[PDB]
Amino acid sequence: YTIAERPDLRVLRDPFSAKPHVLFYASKRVGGDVSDFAAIKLLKFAA
Amino acid sequence: YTIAERPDLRVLRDPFSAKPHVLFYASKRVGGDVSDFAAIKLLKFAA
Numbered sequence: 047y048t049i050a051e052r053p054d055l056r057v058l059r060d061p062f063s064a065k066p067h068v069l070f071y072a073s074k075r076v077g078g079d080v081s082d083f084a085a086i087k088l089l090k091f092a093a
Numbered sequence: 094y095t096i097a098e099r100p101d102l103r104v105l106r107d108p109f110s111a112k113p114h115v116l117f118y119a120s121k122r123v124g125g126d127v128s129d130f131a132a133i134k135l136l137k138f139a140a
Binding site: 063 | 107109110
């Protein structure tokens, strides 16, 4: 499984949007799926 | 009479709110009323 990430949590705050409010904006970006299909096995309870 | 206040003054400004404009925003918080109803007397122009 390969996780791709940007190793920072970018933070934004703005009184400028709504004058009595601060409206914190915190975000980071991340993505991933499997990368080696033969490297992960599962268990199904079907049959 | 009792005055409650904070001595600071906040001078928020924002070209980000109205794009041809600046919107100088100033706020100081202050509050109070009478604390002793006996310490003060008035003069009413009536009979």
